[PDB]
Amino acid sequence: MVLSEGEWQLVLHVWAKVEADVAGHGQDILIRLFKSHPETLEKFDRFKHLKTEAEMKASEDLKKHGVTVLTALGAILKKKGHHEAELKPGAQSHATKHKIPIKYLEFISEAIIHVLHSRHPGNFGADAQGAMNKALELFRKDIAAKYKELGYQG
Numbered sequence: 001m002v003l004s005e006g007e008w009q010l011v012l013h014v015w016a017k018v019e020a021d022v023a024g025h026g027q028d029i030l031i032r033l034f035k036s037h038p039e040t041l042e043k044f045d046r047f048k049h050l051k052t053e054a055e056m057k058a059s060e061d062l063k064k065h066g067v068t069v070l071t072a073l074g075a076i077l078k079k080k081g082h083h084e085a086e087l088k089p090g091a092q093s094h095a096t097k098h099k100i101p102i103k104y105l106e107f108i109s110e111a112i113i114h115v116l117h118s119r120h121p122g123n124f125g126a127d128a129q130g131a132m133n134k135a136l137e138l139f140r141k142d143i144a145a146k147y148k149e150l151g152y153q154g
C-alpha cells in the first residue's frame with residue numbers, strides 16, 4: 001500500500017502534538033494496551049508483576065519503555081513509507097527474541113488510536129484517524145513480511 005502526501009500530513013500533524021509529551025503518551029498507550037489486552041503483559045518479564053493501573057502509572061521503568069517505543073515508531077513514521085532499513089532490527093528482535101505475534105501489533109495499534117482520539121480530538125477527526133490507521137496497517141504489513149523472511153511469521 002502507499003499513503004498519499006495528504007495522508008502523511010495528517011499523521012505527522014497529530015504526531016507533532018504527541019511529541020510535546022512523549023513520556024505521558026507512551027505511558028497512556030502501554031497502560032491502555034495492558035488493560036485492554038492483559039495477555040500482552042505476559043510478554044514483558046520486566047512488567048509482568050504489575051497488578052493494577054495504579055502500579056503501572058507509578059512505574060518509572062514502564063514510563064521509560066513507553067518513551068523508547070514511541071521514539072522508535074516516530075522515527076519510522078517520519079520516513080513516510082521509506083522505512084525498510086529502520087524496520088529490520090526491530091522485526092528481528094520482536095520475532096526471535098521477544099516473540100510477538102502480529103495480533104499483538106494490532107492490539108497496540110488500537111491502543112495508539114484510542115489515546116490519540118482521547119487526547120487530540122480536534123486534530124484527530126475521521127480523516128486523520130483513517131490516515132493513522134493506514135500508516136499503522138502499512139507498518140504491520142511490512143513487519144509481517146519481515147517476520148516471514150526471518151522464519152517466524154508468528
Ligand code: HEM
Binds near residue numbers: 098108
Ligand atoms: C508499535 C509497536 C512496537 C514498537 C515500535 C516496539 C519497539 C520496541 C523497542 C524499540 C524495543 C527495545 C529494543 C528491542 O528489543 O527491539 C522493544 C522491546 C520490547 N518489546 Fe516492543 N515494540 C512494539 C510493540 C511491542 C508489542 C506489541 C509487544 C508485546 C506485547 C512488545 C514487546 C516487547 C518486549 C518484550 C521488549 C523487551 C522489553 C525489555 O526491555 O525487557 N513490543 N520494543
